[PDB]
């Protein structure tokens, strides 16, 4: 197998900034104690590509998580804040677009490369958060 555009995401990343994540989590419905502990976390994100399968791992003092998926193919995800969601991730012009659906709600997480950073932008009912990762 040859190179893929999404190889731009592959590597080991560390959170360096987080904006408005508490308000995003409130909109998602995250309870007080989980919001406080999850908001403190400075996760590492490890992204790998093997054939058609993309794996995104997150490691932090709060939770360790791993999802593996094929673009366009829905999967079951248990999120770090313990939602059981249906997730679909697609590639739109270089941007990984991740929709989570649960309990009649939905949120969108976009992951994109900007300069040497990995930028994560998420939105829930008009509330956006931006989290920036750098190479570890
Ligand atoms: C460390 O507490 C979390 C880790 C992960 C998730 S999530 O369900 O994976 N969605 C998401 C949204 C924006 C982001 F920037 C990232 C990220 O930084 O990876 C992840 C969380 C969702 C709700 C509350 C806390 C979350």
From Swiss-Prot:
SUPFAM superfamilies in the cross-refs: Lipocalins
TM segment ranges: none
Phosphoserine modifications at: 17
Cellular component terms (Gene Ontology): cytoplasm; cytosol; extracellular exosome; lipid droplet; nucleus
Chain positions with Phosphotyrosine modification: 24
Pfam families per UniProt: Lipocalin (PF00061)
Record key words, sorted: Acetylation, Cytoplasm, Lipid-binding, Nucleus, Phosphoprotein, Transport
Molecular-function GO terms, alphabetical: fatty acid binding; hormone receptor binding; long-chain fatty acid binding; long-chain fatty acid transmembrane transporter activity
Function: Lipid transport protein in adipocytes. Binds both long chain fatty acids and retinoic acid. Delivers long-chain fatty acids and retinoic acid to their cognate receptors in the nucleus.
Subunit structure: Monomer. Homodimer. Interacts with PPARG.
Family: Belongs to the calycin superfamily. Fatty-acid binding protein (FABP) family.
Protein name: Fatty acid-binding protein, adipocyte
Lineage of source species: Eukaryota, Metazoa, Chordata, Craniata, Vertebrata
């Amino acid at each position: 197998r040859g190179s893929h555009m999404c190889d731009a995401f592959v590597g080991t990343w560390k959170l360096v900034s987080s904006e408005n994540f508490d308000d995003y989590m409130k909109e998602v419905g995250v309870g007080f104690a989980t919001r406080k502990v999850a908001g403190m976390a400075k996760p590492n994100m490890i992204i790998s590509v093997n054939g058609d399968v993309i794996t995104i791992k997150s490691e932090s003092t709060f939770k360790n998580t791993e999802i593996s998926f094929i673009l366009g193919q829905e999967f079951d995800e248990v999120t770090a804040d313990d939602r059981k969601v249906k997730s679909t991730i697609t590639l739109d012009g270089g941007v990984l677009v991740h929709v989570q659906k649960w309990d009649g709600k939905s949120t969108t997480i976009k992951r994109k490369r900007e300069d040497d950073k990995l930028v994560v932008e998420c939105v829930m009912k008009g509330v956006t958060s931006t989290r920036v990762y750098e190479r570890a």
